[PDB]
Write a protein that binds this ligand. Sequence first.
Ligand SMILES: O=C(O)/C=C/c1ccccc1
Ligand SMILES: O=C(O)/C=C/c1ccccc1
Ligand SMILES: O=C(O)/C=C/c1ccccc1
Lengths: 514, 513, 514
Amino acid sequence: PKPAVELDRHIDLDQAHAVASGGARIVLAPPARDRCRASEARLGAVIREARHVYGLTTGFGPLANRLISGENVRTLQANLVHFLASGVGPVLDWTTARAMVLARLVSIAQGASGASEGTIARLIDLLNSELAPAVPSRGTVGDLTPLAHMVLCLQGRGDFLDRDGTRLDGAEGLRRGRLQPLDLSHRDALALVNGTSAMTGIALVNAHACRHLGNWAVALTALLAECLRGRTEAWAAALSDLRPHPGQKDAAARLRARVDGSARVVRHVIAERRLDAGDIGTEPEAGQDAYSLRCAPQVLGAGFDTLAWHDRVLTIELNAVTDNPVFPPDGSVPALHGGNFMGQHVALTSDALATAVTVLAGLAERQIARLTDERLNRGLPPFLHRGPAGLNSGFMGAQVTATALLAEMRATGPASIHSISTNAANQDVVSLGTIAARLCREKIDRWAEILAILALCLAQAAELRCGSGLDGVSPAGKKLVQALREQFPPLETDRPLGQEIAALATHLLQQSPV
Amino acid sequence: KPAVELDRHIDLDQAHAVASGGARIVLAPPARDRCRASEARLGAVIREARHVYGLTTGFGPLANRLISGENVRTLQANLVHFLASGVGPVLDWTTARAMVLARLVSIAQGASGASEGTIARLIDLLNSELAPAVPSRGTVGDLTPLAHMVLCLQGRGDFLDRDGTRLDGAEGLRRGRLQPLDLSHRDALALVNGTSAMTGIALVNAHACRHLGNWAVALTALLAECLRGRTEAWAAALSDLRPHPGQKDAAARLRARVDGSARVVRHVIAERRLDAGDIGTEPEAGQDAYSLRCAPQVLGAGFDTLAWHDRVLTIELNAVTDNPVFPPDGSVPALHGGNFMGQHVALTSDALATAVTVLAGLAERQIARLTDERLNRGLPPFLHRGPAGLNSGFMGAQVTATALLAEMRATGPASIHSISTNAANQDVVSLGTIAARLCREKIDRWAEILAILALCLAQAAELRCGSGLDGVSPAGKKLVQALREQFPPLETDRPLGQEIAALATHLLQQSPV
Amino acid sequence: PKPAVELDRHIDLDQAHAVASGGARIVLAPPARDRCRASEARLGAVIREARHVYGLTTGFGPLANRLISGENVRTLQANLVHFLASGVGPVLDWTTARAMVLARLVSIAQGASGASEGTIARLIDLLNSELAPAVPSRGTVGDLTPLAHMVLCLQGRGDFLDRDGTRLDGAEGLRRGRLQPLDLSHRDALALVNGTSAMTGIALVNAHACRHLGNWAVALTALLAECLRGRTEAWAAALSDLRPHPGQKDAAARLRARVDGSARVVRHVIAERRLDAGDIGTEPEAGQDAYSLRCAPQVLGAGFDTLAWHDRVLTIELNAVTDNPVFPPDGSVPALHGGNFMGQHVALTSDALATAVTVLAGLAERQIARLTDERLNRGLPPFLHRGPAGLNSGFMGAQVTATALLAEMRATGPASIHSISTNAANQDVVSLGTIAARLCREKIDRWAEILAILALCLAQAAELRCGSGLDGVSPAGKKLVQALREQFPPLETDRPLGQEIAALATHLLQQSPV
Ligand SMILES: O=C(O)/C=C/c1ccccc1
Ligand SMILES: O=C(O)/C=C/c1ccccc1
Ligand SMILES: O=C(O)/C=C/c1ccccc1
């Protein structure tokens, strides 16, 4: 009884990802079907009336001053798909390519693109099938190129990808997924090759992954506190109220919940202690933890607020019409020409999220560095090894790997600042939003690997500190370690961890600890 | 002079008004009462000898060294001393005062324990025409700059007059009619705490960005009047189809700027029905290049980034970023945490810096298009006057704008460079102050790029429409006439460096109205 | 009759790539064999005499303060390979992985590593086979991790790669390659897990690719001049002599040779012309070309000088011993402990080269932008299309793709500046050389794609300007276009170019236009 998302006007990010990931099927609501039929009729009229419209009676880009006779429009649009198919590089992953198709569909569903029923049906069919078009990730300045490749795929002139990433030729794809070859006879090619569908698709996948990684970041910080006698007073709600950033209040509340029931953290407020002359001297530990624990609400919180902004902007973009030209539903004018395809919004939010992800990955990396340092981990074995010290190095290698992954993340900055005048100066400013979204994705993948290493370290640390029975560990903490131990054995002796790290990271990106 | 009464909340405009000296500041009775209550709570915490950071402990990782009451004044005096290791150019007058204001707003919430005298010193500084002279570098995000502020307020550091001229501490206290700061109440941590510096810098960035954004819109509009731009791309209907608040706002403001103009193209091209005889190559395309057609989308994305930045900053400015803190409700004697972690300002400052660089890029490309004889539709190359060749007009200024932009691009986000420090106690740091400062530098470059565009447009408007500016919108005419009051037309090549600099200074503080 | 490289002490970059790419077999010269046999004996003596030596009588990293008894050394070194195998990410390509193996071998050949005959034989056998170890590209801060994975592969406990990148399991690899399983019973594991072999291997492949791409950059700049009536006086030897940078002098000489025999370039020195009163006015074109042509010697030259520096440093690194500890061949002391494994040299040169590659890619991108712009290409069709204008857009899509590739290159900066204290603060400074070399490689790949687009554009532009017969085109220019036309047909009508761009890019990275 696979869930179904009925698309009318608005779709939220979770619904969008459910469809893109194949978790839910999609259906076009009757009201939307009618709006599209109405827009299809407007396109037909615009064409019959020989209105001066980009892509219907003109060339493309700077060549738009070259008018085209009606008799040659099917050729014009066929060549459009052709000359735009210059993409190169690895193909977008299965879920992301599907998210791109969904983004184009949501835009069309608003009823201002003139797409024909058949065209809309082909997109819905793809989304309801187990396939995804195989489209190169590079080539656009922000998303005609990847969309042109999508068109070729839907016509059976390009490869398809199954859930595993294995490619099928065009014919096989249409066959296996029961897809009908795309037919652009209605001259509605610009309804498919238009907008910010690719960057939006990539960004929606980034948004979903960050939600899960954010949950792990919280869960692991909480478990870290249980392994290092962390002080919970730094996570007090009263502190959040004094500096009311939503993301911070949320992070602190979630951290408190994770360690609820723990007998391993320090819950005493230090100021409750009254000192006398005999207390004046040097104590073993300071009354507050290092920042990787004490400032977690503030660091994680800032990241959560960046994601919140990113998602607010993305929700608007996903449900908008980023086409050019557009055909006003009210019929005020035959069509409007502008630049709603300029993806500066997703470009700027992706760059911002990328920075936030790098910052949070840095936190996890430092948490690993502290947990594995015998001089800072308050009594735990160096690098959390088991067996004789020296002969065994435990997580010593994995710890450096986390640092290496972080260092690589830092080498890449915002994509948005690199606009270069192109297309014979017609596109004198470009968003590079697709690139921005892809760079953010890479950082998200690195962050998952760093968190994976931290998770494996914590599972081991929890047992070293509290015994295999995890005595004193919170219910949430126990469940997380027990779940990890179902697939990842304790490190009783040194062994290669690379494959386990990669395996766990893939899981972190798709599911939260609950 | 207007007065801003500070109770609990203050908006960014009120904050800048006080920081810039445009308005006096007064602490509302309710705020004074809350602060007196907090002062009393600190007194009790001290009398009770509660274990509290900075009152009974050393600092940083040295907090494990407990301190006896008789030594606390020395302890807090040393705190200010060892933290005063800042270097680099001092913060400008307005920004330094904004930092003072930020600390005051935090204290006014009533959880810092600041004494009436300490609060009075901050208010006095803000009501005077002076600013403390504080080095800009040294903090990983803001004890160092605040420590320097304290030294200045005690007359042990320099002050800055509105012009930036420095005065020694003693002279500063006398000229500003300020009394030396006295921390005998052991309330030093009420002054050396939080995110005051980055917040002060960021609020000045916010104000400057609002003005530059107004200029970016006004100059884009005037560009359209000089290049026969098509207004249909700025139609509200398009905004409604892609409802980003910033984009809708940008488009509306653009339309308003060109209202009444006879120099722009208002025809919707799809209205035209083509005949077989029209098929061929026409003189111009039916749509403009992106620097005009996509202005709503580019400026809009920038405006939405600034809106996010401002929402976050408003919360930070009105929050208590202190540590430790003394709960007004008396639930516990004090709370220890990390509200001083400036990650929020760090991330928003970096995000804004990117948006600023993007928008400066748009302005830079608009100059490049306007001054190009192959692209400016009939205007002289580089908008020169007099004999061509003999005169190059704005040819130099155009390259200078490109140079300014290229420089902006060389600097990226500051937040990603966290480095474990303070003997690993501060294993993660925000670098928020650095982030806000880097954003300020890009903002200054953007102002210079816009200044160049404005001078180019004033010349272009006259070359296209004559000195009378025939067909130019009322807003466009008013803008050019205003500029012409201080900046003469370029009838023959002349040095523009000083004019560009002077105009940029203006753009940062005032909008085209 | 497959060539053979006899390794004694020194090997140049060309010989190294010849072996790494499988173009030549490798053999150890008699003196090298003897130096290695002697070093092997020295390691035996060190063990026999129970000398305090890292990895032989101590734990690893900060754990080196834990001394180890002789009977546990086999286990110690076995665990070393284990805990270090935490690598993740896509495996290094066939040639690069083998280049890494070669790098370790050359270091060992200096006779200060103590590697046994068998160990050396395993490396040689690998290089003389058609296989490469499958090693993850990420994990090192600069190269124990990737080398540990190498060891596992050589023992038949890790995958292998054939020339096509198809993976084989350990067993299949040893079988298909007719290889013997690596046996570290002599306790010479540190002879394999040591040094800067990975970054050096990666960098030597970057060096080879940049030489070819550099040749294409020159050839295409020259052809561009023949398509736009470029002035050769800007490339005069006299100018080079006035600003004697080696790279510039060479670039200018190579550019002149490429257009030798051309009737399509302007060779007249403008200053020879004497002007009269009737000449004063506005001429159609300026007396000098735009920078993308006029400043080619200077821009290409600076890039070539950067590559020259990179190669000088790399040559030293490749032929050096970057191991720790080391066993002095002169027998002065049993062993020396230091940090010759710190890859700061490769890190800084890789970062410098990466910057130069981005700059040169920028030149190529602007050359494409100028050539396709009807307002700047002096009479050529917009975007070099054929067929009716507007209906056909030619390379309009490819041109934007080139811009997108360049913008993405610019988003990534130097890797070296991101050092982070790790390994419980033992490694308080790290080089990140491997990452730097990898980032440089990605940029080289992007540069090749951009050059490929420019090459396709120039082939079309040359025929459009000079006819299919290429009348007036230099002999070198004709040969290049004709060579390209053998595999890439003219663009008579718009068609997808993505796959062709990628195919040509692969070719440009391995062969120069000759
Ligand atoms: O001016 C436009 O709206 C179209 C630009 C463009 C650029 C490259 C390929 C196709 C269209
Ligand atoms: O841990 C804290 O709250 C204090 C840190 C610190 C570090 C350097 C100087 C002053 C305070
Ligand atoms: O001090 C050294 O030379 C060794 C460091 C090290 C760090 C991580 C893994 C293995 C060795």
